[PDB]
Amino acid sequence: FSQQREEDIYRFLKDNGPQRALVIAQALGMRTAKDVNRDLYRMKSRHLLDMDEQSKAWTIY
Amino acid sequence: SQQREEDIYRFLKDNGPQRALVIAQALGMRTAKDVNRDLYRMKSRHLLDMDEQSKAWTIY
DNA sequence: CGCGCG
DNA sequence: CGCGCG
């Protein structure tokens, strides 16, 4: 987390719809999905986001 | 190849099947992540094998 | 290649 | 909790 990145993540998914972790990271200047996954799963635990297990895509809920 | 693999082999040979954490600490390192790259690299070459139940690596 | 895991 | 992942 660095630092309110979850806010940026939230804006991207809100404006671009359901996207995989790799696309989210690249849209924020990062390289791999590992750079944002701990954030995504932290937001998911707080019911901010949710992931479709089939498409591995993250969306706002 | 990277000499460390030879050291992992000797440890498993003398101490028997061990989990990745034990192997790493035996070679001076801290976590399993420090040796997992070598382990699976040796597995693909059929040097080692991991018991999926106990997660212990052995000579195969 | 899914990996979230500290 | 397996995770090797670049």
CATH of the domain at B60: 1.10.10.10
Nucleotide nearest to A20 (CA to C1'): C2
Name the nt closest to A22 by C-alpha to C1'.
C1
Q: What is the DSSP letter of B7?
A: H
Q: Is the CB of A34 under 7 A from strand D?
A: yes
Return the SS3 of A41: helix
B2 near B44, Cβ under 8 Å?
no
The nucleotides of chain D lying under 7 Å from a protein CB are 1-6
How far are the Cα atoms of B9, B24, B40 from residue A26, in angstroms, in the given order? 40, 34, 29
Nearest of B53, B49, B55, B48 to residue B7 by alpha carbon: B48
Helices and strands per DSSP (H, E), number in chain B: 3, 3
Give the domain range for residue A61: 1-61
Contact present, A61 and A51 (Cβ < 8 Å) = no
Determination technique for this entry: X-ray
Say how far apart CA B36 and CA A3 lie, in whole Å. Answer: 30
Give the count of domains, chain A: 1
C1’ D5 / CA B31, Å: 17
- Give residues with Cβ within 8 angstroms of B13, minimum separation 6: B59
- Angstrom distance (rounded) from CA A2 to CA A7: 11
The residue behind tokens 């990062």 is: A30
Helices (H), B1-60: 4-15, 20-26, 36-43
